[PDB]
Amino acid sequence: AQADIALIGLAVMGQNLILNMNDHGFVVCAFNRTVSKVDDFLANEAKGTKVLGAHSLEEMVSKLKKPRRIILLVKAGQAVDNFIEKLVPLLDIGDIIIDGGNSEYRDTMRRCRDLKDKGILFVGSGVSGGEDGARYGPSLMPGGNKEAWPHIKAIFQGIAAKVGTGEPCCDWVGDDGAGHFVKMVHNGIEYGDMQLICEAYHLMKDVLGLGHKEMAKAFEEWNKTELDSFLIEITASILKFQDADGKHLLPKIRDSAGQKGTGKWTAISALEYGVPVTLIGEAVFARCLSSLKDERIQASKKLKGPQNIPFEGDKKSFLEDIRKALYASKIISYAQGFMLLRQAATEFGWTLNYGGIALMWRGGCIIRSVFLGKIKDAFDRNPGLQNLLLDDFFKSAVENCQDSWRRAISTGVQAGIPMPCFTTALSFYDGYRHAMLPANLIQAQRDYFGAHTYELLAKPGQFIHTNWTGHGG
Amino acid sequence: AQADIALIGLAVMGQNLILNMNDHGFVVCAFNRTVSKVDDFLANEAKGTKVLGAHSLEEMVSKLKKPRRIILLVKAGQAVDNFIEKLVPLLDIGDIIIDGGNSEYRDTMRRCRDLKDKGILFVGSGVSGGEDGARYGPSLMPGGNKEAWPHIKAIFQGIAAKVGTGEPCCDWVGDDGAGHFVKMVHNGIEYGDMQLICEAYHLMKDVLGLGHKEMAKAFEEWNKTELDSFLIEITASILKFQDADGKHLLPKIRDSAGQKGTGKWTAISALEYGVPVTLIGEAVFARCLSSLKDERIQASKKLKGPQNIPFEGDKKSFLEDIRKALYASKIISYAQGFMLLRQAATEFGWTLNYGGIALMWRGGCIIRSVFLGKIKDAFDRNPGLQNLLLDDFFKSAVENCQDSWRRAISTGVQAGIPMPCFTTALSFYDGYRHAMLPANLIQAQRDYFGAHTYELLAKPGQFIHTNWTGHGG
Ligand SMILES: Nc1ncnc2c1ncn2[C@@H]1O[C@H](CO)[C@@H](O)[C@H]1OP(=O)(O)O
Ligand SMILES: Nc1ncnc2c1ncn2[C@@H]1O[C@H](CO)[C@@H](O)[C@H]1OP(=O)(O)O
Numbered sequence: 001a002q003a004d005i006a007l008i009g010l011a012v013m014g015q016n017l018i019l020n021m022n023d024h025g026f027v028v029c030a031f032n033r034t035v036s037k038v039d040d041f042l043a044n045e046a047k048g049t050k051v052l053g054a055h056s057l058e059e060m061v062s063k064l065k066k067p068r069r070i071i072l073l074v075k076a077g078q079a080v081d082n083f084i085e086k087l088v089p090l091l092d093i094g095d096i097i098i099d100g101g102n103s104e105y106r107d108t109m110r111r112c113r114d115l116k117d118k119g120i121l122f123v124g125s126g127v128s129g130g131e132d133g134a135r136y137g138p139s140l141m142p143g144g145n146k147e148a149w150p151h152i153k154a155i156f157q158g159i160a161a162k163v164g165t166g167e168p169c170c171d172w173v174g175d176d177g178a179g180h181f182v183k184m185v186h187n188g189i190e191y192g193d194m195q196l197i198c199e200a201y202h203l204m205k206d207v208l209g210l211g212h213k214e215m216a217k218a219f220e221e222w223n224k225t226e227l228d229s230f231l232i233e234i235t236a237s238i239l240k241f242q243d244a245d246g247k248h249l250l251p252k253i254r255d256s257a258g259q260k261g262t263g264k265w266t267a268i269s270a271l272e273y274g275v276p277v278t279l280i281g282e283a284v285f286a287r288c289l290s291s292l293k294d295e296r297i298q299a300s301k302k303l304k305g306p307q308n309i310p311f312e313g314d315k316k317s318f319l320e321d322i323r324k325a326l327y328a329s330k331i332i333s334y335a336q337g338f339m340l341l342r343q344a345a346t347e348f349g350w351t352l353n354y355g356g357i358a359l360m361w362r363g364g365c366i367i368r369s370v371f372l373g374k375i376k377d378a379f380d381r382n383p384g385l386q387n388l389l390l391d392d393f394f395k396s397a398v399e400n401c402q403d404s405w406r407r408a409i410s411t412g413v414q415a416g417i418p419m420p421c422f423t424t425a426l427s428f429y430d431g432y433r434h435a436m437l438p439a440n441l442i443q444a445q446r447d448y449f450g451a452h453t454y455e456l457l458a459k460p461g462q463f464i465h466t467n468w469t470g471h472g473g
Numbered sequence: 474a475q476a477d478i479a480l481i482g483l484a485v486m487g488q489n490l491i492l493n494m495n496d497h498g499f500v501v502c503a504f505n506r507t508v509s510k511v512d513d514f515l516a517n518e519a520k521g522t523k524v525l526g527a528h529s530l531e532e533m534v535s536k537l538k539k540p541r542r543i544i545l546l547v548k549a550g551q552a553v554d555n556f557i558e559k560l561v562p563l564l565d566i567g568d569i570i571i572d573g574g575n576s577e578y579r580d581t582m583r584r585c586r587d588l589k590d591k592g593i594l595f596v597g598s599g600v601s602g603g604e605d606g607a608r609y610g611p612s613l614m615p616g617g618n619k620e621a622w623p624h625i626k627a628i629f630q631g632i633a634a635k636v637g638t639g640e641p642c643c644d645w646v647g648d649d650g651a652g653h654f655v656k657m658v659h660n661g662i663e664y665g666d667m668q669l670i671c672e673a674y675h676l677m678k679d680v681l682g683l684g685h686k687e688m689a690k691a692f693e694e695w696n697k698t699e700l701d702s703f704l705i706e707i708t709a710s711i712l713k714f715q716d717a718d719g720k721h722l723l724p725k726i727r728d729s730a731g732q733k734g735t736g737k738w739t740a741i742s743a744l745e746y747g748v749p750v751t752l753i754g755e756a757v758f759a760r761c762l763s764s765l766k767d768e769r770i771q772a773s774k775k776l777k778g779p780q781n782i783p784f785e786g787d788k789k790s791f792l793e794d795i796r797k798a799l800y801a802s803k804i805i806s807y808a809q810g811f812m813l814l815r816q817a818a819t820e821f822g823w824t825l826n827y828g829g830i831a832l833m834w835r836g837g838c839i840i841r842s843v844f845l846g847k848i849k850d851a852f853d854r855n856p857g858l859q860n861l862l863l864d865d866f867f868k869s870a871v872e873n874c875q876d877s878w879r880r881a882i883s884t885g886v887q888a889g890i891p892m893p894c895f896t897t898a899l900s901f902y903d904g905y906r907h908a909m910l911p912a913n914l915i916q917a918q919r920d921y922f923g924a925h926t927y928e929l930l931a932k933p934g935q936f937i938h939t940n941w942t943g944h945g946g
């Protein structure tokens with residue numbers, strides 16, 4: 001009994017987190033499967049720190065103060081269960097296991113119940129910000145068994161990133177899967193935000209003909225307006241960056257976007273629960289499309305585009321319009337993001353604090369921005385808000401951005417620039433805005449070809465079946 | 474031994490199919506869980522037919538000739554397994570169970586293996602066309618254990634719908650889940666096609682101001698061009714239809730589109746396998762959006778649209794442009810549809826005949842059209858075709874439709890008409906066409922914030938990690 005908490009997982013993320021913990025005055029007993037890495041760590045990155053290193057799970061379990069708090073930061077699916085397998089022999093009733101890997105929300109749900117059943121408090125939390133984030137201030141998103149929360153509270157919130165008015169970007173999210181689900185809606189939104197920038201970039205590059213210096217300059221001006229955000233910032237950096245030969249490196253790298261499943265999963269949940277999260281879906285699908293790199297080289301030789309009409313208009317005005325389109329669209333993506341969180345709250349019965357979450361994403365994580373701030377006080381102003389687009393700030397920000405957004409999409413469309421996410425955003429906006437949508441023809445068709453029944457507009461609730469076929473005959 | 478085949482499931486679909494079978498000279502032993510319905514059937518719809526009716530599963534099993542062929546048309550998930558449970562006691566090695574319900578492709582895979590294991594040949598087939606389809610000519614899509622196929626061959630293909638040059642719209646699709654998967658990609662495409670028409674309809678209604686008579690007239694002209702298809706045909710009918718008070722009924726019915734999971738599932742599979750099936754996804758999401766009927770009535774009061782600019786242009790030209798937009802988009806949806814089938818062929822290792830499938834969808838089913846014909850001889854012309862957009866017919870049909878399609882989307886966008894599917898279609902087309910897409914910035918960002926590595930454009934295969942952060946400092 002001396003180590004406050006133990007962490008199993010000596011990858012960069014685990015090391016940088018153990019280190020941040022130590023720096024906040026917590027003694028950490030490090031453990032890892034290939035126990036050599038523990039020794040390596042102790043001699044190297046952890047030399048001179050207060051950290052203890054175990055060489056067996058039972059040693060690690062002995063070094064702990066009660067209630068035993070151990071953390072699993074094992075990149076995993078299977079591997080987490082196996083560790084849980086091992087640990088429960090060794091644990092007293094009331095001991096805590098936190099799982100920091102980006103797990104599947106349902107696995108977390110399962111695990112939490114099972115361990116609760118065997119007296120152990122399980123919490124799964126999303127950790128975000130990468131390795132430099134892990135080191136000095138991660139967003140942390142904990143969920144599972146709330147009994148554990150006062151016991152891990154101090155650590156989690158001390159190592160958490162802290163926003164301007166000193167609050168940690170870490171607070172308990174909710175029951176069983178809540179943290180892990182919140183975590184993966186986050187990565188979904190992250191996918192959305194990067195595709196929106198790729199599109200803004202494609203429009204400046206092919207329609208406006210800007211070279212990468214001017215383009216980087218534009219991204220920098222943008223990081224000083226409503227778009228003050230980490231991804232706009234590093235984008236200006238990436239565009240500026242010059243290689244060993246002094247030429248820009250972005251033109252050099254292969255356009256096949258990789259994935260590690262979390263964004264895919266956000267889109268799949270929307271589909272399962274019937275939540276119209278369209279930009280994230282479009283984003284996952286735009287990464288799928290770039291993977292067909294060979295196929296597009298082939299299609300370009302054969303499929304033809306619109307007649308080339310040079311951009312005839314002011315470049316500065318257009319650069320403005322793209323700013324406004326990227327922003328109005330970002331709003332729609334986030335609005336859809338929290339509709340997902342909302343529906344899952346009804347689905348699994350969790351009382352999520354949407355402003356709490358907005359705040360946990362305001363610092364630490366890759367999607368940090370001034371923007372999550374305005375989202376947070378939309379939900380402070382009204383925590384029962386049904387949809388972000390109805391909060392006056394956003395309601396007005398979109399209303400203002402509106403014909404710049406339409407003018408950016410019309411030119412892109414004319415010019416042949418692929419804009420999946422920019423167009424879904426307009427399509428969702430106009431969809432949601434309309435109190436009468438042609439979905440009644442879907443319904444009339446379905447009652448016709450497949451006997452499905454339909455409701456009248458006045459008298460919701462009663463279902464009718466008209467015999468269309470022949471109106472006599 | 475007298476009944477050629479047995480069918481368990483006396484719903485309208487089961488009755489109309491038993492009846493079609495009888496008419497092709499096959500003695501059918503009908504069975505159903507609530508055995509009263511068998512008696513009801515025999516006295517009523519089946520009076521004077523050659524059909525036999527059982528009153529117990531073991532009686533039904535006795536009435537059968539060997540190899541025993543029984544059909545499950547039980548609307549189900551669970552219920553099918555339970556019947557399989559019952560039936561295997563009663564069956565000899567080599568007996569066949571066909572499952573006609575719209576099952577989950579993975580359940581079918583499972584079931585096929587398990588029964589193959591116990592000597593029984595399982596085949597799951599999609600059945601399509603509804604009850605009037607079932608009666609006189611269903612599309613049938615069989616998959617599972619090919620040993621069973623010569624034994625059910627005659628029945629299935631005799632009752633199948635037959636296309637102009639006399640071939641049945643039924644041929645063996647492939648192993649284990651192939652039939653059931655082909656079936657559900659079909660319903661996905663069906664979703665796509667109806668949303669595209671709702672959009673064409675929304676543009677004629679709000680931009681062009683056409684009343685439902687003229688609108689119906691337009692749909693009828695369209696069913697006489699490249700768009701000769703059953704859904705264009707019944708749409709003209711639905712628009713014309715007048716209620717008991719002599720006013721049009723479509724304006725009367727509630728715009729909240731229902732779902733029964735199959736379209737949802739197509740979109741989810743695309744996401745799981747990384748296949749960019751975007752219109753179907755947009756379609757499922759446009760039905761999700763209409764379900765939020767109360768929410769849109771609320772949003773309409775608060776969210777504002779573009780400045781109302783009257784349509785200033787020729788109505789007839791625009792009606793043309795919408796024809797061309799609906800068509801170019803339909804092409805992109807189908808092209809994506811078969812990319813899904815293709816990837817599943819690589820995924821589960823089935824040798825699907827894409828022209829075979831195109832043909833099975835050419836008659837019978839709700840998506841029947843002259844269009845599936847041209848798709849079929851694209852794949853006859855080249856069965857190794859990687860993507861429908863590369864077949865000269867389509868390659869040219871899109872090239873022709875192209876600035877009508879762009880002009881329809883630009884006006885819709887300006888006017889505020891929600892067009893999810895029409896815009897994804899342009900976005901996928903321009904995406905696929907481009908041999909260089911901004912996905913390299915996604916990659917550069919990911920190597921920066923999350924150490925993910927990237928390939929150079931020349932030298933695919935080697936992965937680099939640049940330390941961006943500071944280029945010195
Ligand atoms: N199957 C497994 N069982 C337990 N831990 C594992 C594991 N697979 C991966 N991990 C751990 O996940 C962490 C990050 O990938 C590593 O510490 C790794 O342990 P290792 O050091 O033994 O590779
Ligand atoms: N749980 C169940 N077990 C077996 N058959 C079922 C069933 N649930 C639904 N079905 C059958 O599915 C068919 C179409 O819905 C019906 O014939 C129905 O039988 P029923 O006639 O007894 O309702």
